[PDB]
Nucleic acid binder design. Structure first.
Lengths: 50, 63, 76, 71
RNA sequence: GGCAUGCUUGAGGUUCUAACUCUGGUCCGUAAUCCGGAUCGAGGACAGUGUAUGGUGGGCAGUUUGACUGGGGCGGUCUCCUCCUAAAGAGUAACGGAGGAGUACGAAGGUGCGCUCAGACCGGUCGGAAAUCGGUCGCAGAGUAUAAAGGCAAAAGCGCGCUUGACUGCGAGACAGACACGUCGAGCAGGUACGAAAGUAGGUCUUAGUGAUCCGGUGGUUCUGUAUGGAAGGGCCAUCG
RNA sequence: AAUGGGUCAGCGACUUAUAUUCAGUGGCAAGCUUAACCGUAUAGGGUAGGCGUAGCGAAAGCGAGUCUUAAUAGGGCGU
């Protein structure tokens, strides 16, 4: 369960942080979650915390 | 003035007219575990407990 | 081969007995999975912690088929 | 920084509350530049504040009680 | 490509004497051969000595090397979870009896709609004590991601369709508690997913799955920014060892 | 059947200084007080400085309120 970052779609540097078992599923996820700057839901994506 | 305060407790304890403020602990460097209910309830700036007052007010040279 | 290692005793129980007066957040029963079920005006939180919502007097009544224990709060 | 209560404006003499006029009546301090005035009681006499900047509730008292707020 | 020769410069090789060197010879100071000075003889840009840096270095020095313990040494144990000891509220010891954790999951989460177990038995092609199918009897004796305890028909168990509420700002009240940490949470405002609509959703049947401060690293941030205008460096918020 | 003391007479152990907190008793009182140093010097001058009369905030800042926040809602601290 390596840990990953989920950078927002819009311009803001707001992100979420979670973990993902890299070994079983290699591809990235596109979860739609809330954004505290634009005050509405957008979709997120990334990995690679550093 | 022959009464030197400690330098550490003057940097963790600001003094207001309703006690001594201090920041909460445990919030650094492993944070992807904890549930928000626990993150937003450690974000404020509390005031100090009564058992701890007369311990710190000797470290800070108030006595 | 060697066996010490107990745990640290969670302080379970039943607070607020038969004729008490309550508020809106009182807890009334820690629990370990439904010795007592949610009666009339109580909550049943996450780990089966009961709690009040309205004000009055605890009851502790047995009702229904299956004979289950219903903690209700009566406006009396 | 320092600040002056509204009640202490009747403690200078000459009715011109300058920056130096608060120093010689030792009401404030030496080496203090920027001064406010906040609401803490009635003033008592008509004085002309200048160089110092009162709050909102203080200037509603001084302008009514005969004072004049200029710079 | 190279042609040439230059201009500079490194690295190597040989040679030369004028620097430095001589615990060489003979004059002089001197009645002394320490020390100088004069001249020949040898070595010669080496040796040697400053300063910056690698290596070796108990030659030498300052120091560290835990506790519980039916004496202490050997062995075993230092944190978290469930049961028993525990005397029908909580709590409660022993090198007292028994066991487990240092994680998994993008669906094993949300929600709407549906549906029931193991076993017994008799019938049935190559299985055959036992696979699949049909049937009666069942009345939780199954199941529960993971130990045991307490639970589970609005099933907390099983299947299918859409999805992201594994949300942000909070939080009256309480339970526990030396303190630091801890647990439950109605309701309000933002913006959402199901459902015809009431309504349900702030992770998983619950309880283990973890480590303060200081450091430093990375994203947002005018809040500061040592004459002034900027920057560096701070600060706050988010997150990593 | 643990320690100490052969008896007498002399000496022999909670002090001082500078800062600060709480009580007792006093002075002036929204104000109280001066340190060095001057001085016919225990008087007098000297109010620089300190504590108070207003807080909340990490800070700029705003002020009987202010901080968090999209907040004008709640809540913390304060009157």
């Amino acid at each position: 369960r390596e840990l990953i970052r989920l950078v927002s779609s819009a311009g803001t540097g707001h992100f979420y942080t979670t973990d993902k078992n890299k070994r079983t599923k290699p591809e990235k996820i596109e979860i739609k979650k809330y954004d505290p700057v634009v005050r509405q839901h957008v979709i997120y994506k990334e990995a690679k915390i550093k | 003035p022959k009464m030197k305060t400690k330098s550490g407790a003057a940097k963790r304890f600001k003094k207001t007219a309703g006690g001594l403020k201090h920041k909460h602990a445990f919030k650094s460097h492993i944070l992807t575990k904890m549930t928000t209910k626990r993150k937003r309830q450690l974000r404020g700036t509390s005031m100090l407990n009564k058992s701890d007052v007369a311990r710190v007010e000797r470290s800070l040279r108030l006595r | 081969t060697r066996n010490g290692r107990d745990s640290e005793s969670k302080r379970l129980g039943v607070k607020l007995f038969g004729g008490q007066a309550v508020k809106a957040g009182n807890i009334l029963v820690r629990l370990r999975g439904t010795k007592f079920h949610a009666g009339y005006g109580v909550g049943l939180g996450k780990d089966h912690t009961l709690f009040a919502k309205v004000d009055g007097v605890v009851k502790f009544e047995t009702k229904g088929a299956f004979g289950r224990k219903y903690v209700s709060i009566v406006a009396a | 920084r320092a600040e002056v209560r509204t009640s202490e404006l009747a403690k200078v003499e000459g009715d011109v509350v300058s920056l130096q006029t608060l120093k010689d009546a030792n009401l404030i301090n030496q080496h203090v530049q920027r001064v406010k005035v906040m609401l803490s009681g009635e003033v008592g006499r008509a004085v002309t504040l200048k160089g110092i900047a009162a709050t909102k509730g203080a200037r509603a008292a001084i302008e009514a009680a005969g004072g004049k707020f200029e710079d």
